[PDB]
Design a binder for this molecule. Structure first.
Ligand SMILES: *[C@@H]1O[C@H](CO)[C@@H](O)[C@H](O)[C@H]1NC(C)=O
Ligand SMILES: *[C@@H]1O[C@H](CO)[C@@H](O)[C@H](O)[C@H]1NC(C)=O
Lengths: 56, 50
């Protein structure tokens, strides 16, 4: 629920009616297929709030 | 507010329940169907006199 934006260097996700940038995490996006047919695909690292928590 | 047309179509699909992956994975098919429908509209209005 939102749209991928970019301020030139980093990529953020915000709603479609108000600029509220936030880190693209796993709970903000859903996985559907591989990136070989989507026209306009760009490489970007997604965050997962499970790897830093599993450090202990 | 400027916006790419594929993203506009993704929003339209979200407005009826369909997700964005259905459009982004079948964009060429939807574009071809839209072009064919727009082309058929002309001959449908031309041939039919009523
Ligand atoms: C884009 O935003 C990030 C985080 O707010 C910041 O670190 C970066 O410098 C910004 N880039 C530009 C070109 O302003
Ligand atoms: C970066 O994107 C290109 C397509 O623009 C893709 O071919 C490449 O595999 C991507 N890089 C990685 C590490 O996946």
């Amino acid at each position: 629920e939102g749209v991928f934006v970019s301020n030139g260097t980093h990529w953020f996700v915000t709603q479609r009616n108000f600029y509220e940038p936030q880190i693209i995490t796993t709970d903000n996006t859903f996985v559907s297929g591989n990136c070989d047919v989507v026209i306009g695909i760009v490489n970007n690292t997604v965050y997962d709030p499970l790897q830093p928590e599993l450090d202990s | 507010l400027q916006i790419p047309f594929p993203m506009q179509m993704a929003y339209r699909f979200n407005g009826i329940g369909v997700t964005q992956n259905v459009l982004y994975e079948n964009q060429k098919l939807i574009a071809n169907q839209f072009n064919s429908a727009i082309g058929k509209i002309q001959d449908s209005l031309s041939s039919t006199p009523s």
